[PDB]
Homo-oligomer: A and B are copies of this chain.
């Protein structure tokens, strides 16, 4: 049963000001879970004012010493650990991802990120700066203020926690809008946040839609900082709204056309295993997903053959079943877009190696699909599919594949598979990607920054670098008489 469905302001639950509610549905059963309060600008304003009050100098939250902000973040992680089974179940109901993946990947990431950043609270350190004989000059990394977080539906809790953890450890307060498709875990986190003993108004949560709640957050004159995870087009709008309002600081985590490069000297079975996971994890609906699998011609045919085997053997079905590795797509909209891209694949001349249609009708499941013979100007090679489709391209030289890998407007991640030291490091430095994996895929750490080059994002999440998004530099310069 879903207990938390309301708007969370000042550690209180609230009906929307309009009284309106919206439904969240289970993609696997195709049935409606519950209804959630549908917020709007009046609700954002009530949340922002709360966050402002909790942020005023002299408030309890601003009076906490640094280590007690740490201790609270550990207390949050501890409760998320206690109710892990329940949070992973709610994520599965909302997203369709396999329960065991939500438990061991999503929730594990949530706990690790919170503990990591908990330990940053009392180590956020500015500088003392040598100037003149009679001057004392130093800098302070102060909290930036009221922070908005807007997150997508593919990793609903994790993308929020990547925001909540650095922001709170730096002493900010927050307004959160989860995706309208996936509100359930955010709202649950809220009960845990009040249980952890965060003062009222430090974290507020307003569900609802993008053009209503989201745009009101990005345009709010008393929000100082916004962090957004989602599509490139909405991120442009969000940064535009931020600039037309009060010039709030913006972190953008956007899409990518992520390349995956398999050299002739790769461990081929490792490359196949990693490229398969990198394409198909979370039903393909992952910002890190491999959209272009470049395979050098010496192992092209054997890579394809081994990839078709993995794809034909990947279990698809009920996400609450131990055996499932692939649940359903998120909703009818995405389901249709993926099938249209598959058809363009066939129509544009790519060789269909397996799958390529719905799995059994009635459900939002798509057969895992592999295309070979894919070229750069094909649609399946140029567009984010957000579905279980592995397009495999061929290349000849390192220099050639660097150019084809970089000739995109995106740059979130890349992966290289080679046994050669020079090749690995030549590619790591030349690929214009925020993360370059070498002989691995989807290797994320709370302590390693993540984010995009070019139109894949602004700023970083995770690692010490996340702290720079959540703090404002102040120079204090004292002249001694």
Which residues of A come within 8 Å of B, CB atoms?
57, 127, 129-131, 135, 137, 139-140, 142, 224, 232, 235-236, 239-240, 243-244, 246-247, 249, 252, 254, 267, 270, 402, 409, 424, 428-430, 433-440, 443, 445, 447-451, 453-455, 457-458, 460, 463-465, 468, 472-481
A465 contacts across to B, CB distance below 8 A: 139, 473
CB distance from A105 to the nearest CB of B (A): 16
Known contacts A129-B463, A249-B458, A454-B224, A475 near B435 by CB under 8 Å:
yes
Residue of B nearest to A246 (CB): B455
The residue that A449 contacts in the complex, of B270, B440, B458, B473, with Cβ under 8 A, is B473
The residue that A402 contacts in the complex, of B57, B232, B239, B243, with Cβ under 8 A, is B57
Closest 7 A/B residue pairs (Cβ): A440-B479, A239-B243, A438-B478, A240-B243, A435-B475, A428-B476, A247-B455
CB distance from A478 to the nearest CB of B (A): 4
A428 contacts across to B, CB distance below 8 A: 474, 476
Known contacts A247-B236, A448-B477, A477-B448, A472 near B455 by CB under 8 Å:
no
Q: Flag if B475 contacts A434 (CB, 8 Å).
A: yes
Cα distance A440–B134 in the bound complex, in angstroms: 11
Q: Flag if B243 contacts A243 (CB, 8 Å).
A: yes
Given contacts A239-B239, A239-B247, A243-B243, 12 further A-B contacts (CB under 8 A): A131-B448, A137-B445, A139-B463, A142-B429, A247-B252, A247-B455, A434-B472, A434-B474, A435-B475, A435-B476, A438-B477, A443-B479
Cα distance A438–B244 in the bound complex, in angstroms: 33
Residue of B nearest to A441 (CB): B479
A435 contacts across to B, CB distance below 8 A: 474-477
A477 contacts across to B, CB distance below 8 A: 435-438, 440, 443, 445, 448
Known contacts A246-B455, A438-B478, A443-B479, A464 near B127 by CB under 8 Å:
yes
A254 contacts across to B, CB distance below 8 A: 247
Residue of B nearest to A480 (CB): B439
The residue that A131 contacts in the complex, of B267, B438, B447, B480, with Cβ under 8 A, is B447
CB distance from A462 to the nearest CB of B (A): 9
Counting every copy of the chain, the complex holds 2
Known contacts A235-B247, A438-B478, A473 near B460 by CB under 8 Å:
yes
CB distance from A314 to the nearest CB of B (A): 22
A443 contacts across to B, CB distance below 8 A: 135, 477, 479
CB distance from A200 to the nearest CB of B (A): 22
Q: Flag if B247 contacts A448 (CB, 8 Å).
A: no
Residue of B nearest to A235 (CB): B247
Residue of B nearest to A463 (CB): B129
A-B contacts, 9 of them at CB < 8 A, read: A57-B402, A139-B463, A239-B243, A239-B247, A240-B244, A247-B457, A434-B475, A438-B478, A439-B480
CB distance from A294 to the nearest CB of B (A): 17
Cα distance A232–B254 in the bound complex, in angstroms: 27
CB distance from A388 to the nearest CB of B (A): 24
Q: Flag if A448 contacts B137 (CB, 8 Å).
A: yes
CB distance from A387 to the nearest CB of B (A): 25
Cα distance A424–B138 in the bound complex, in angstroms: 14
Residue of B nearest to A132 (CB): B445
CB distance from A404 to the nearest CB of B (A): 14
Residue of B nearest to A439 (CB): B479
Residue of B nearest to A254 (CB): B247
Q: Flag if A436 contacts B476 (CB, 8 Å).
A: yes
Q: Flag if A475 contacts B447 (CB, 8 Å).
A: no
Cα distance A270–B451 in the bound complex, in angstroms: 48
Q: Flag if B247 contacts A475 (CB, 8 Å).
A: no
Q: Flag if A139 contacts B449 (CB, 8 Å).
A: yes
Known contacts A137-B445, A434-B473, A447-B130, A246 near B478 by CB under 8 Å:
no
Cα distance A249–B451 in the bound complex, in angstroms: 13
A481 contacts across to B, CB distance below 8 A: 267, 270, 439
Residue of B nearest to A433 (CB): B474
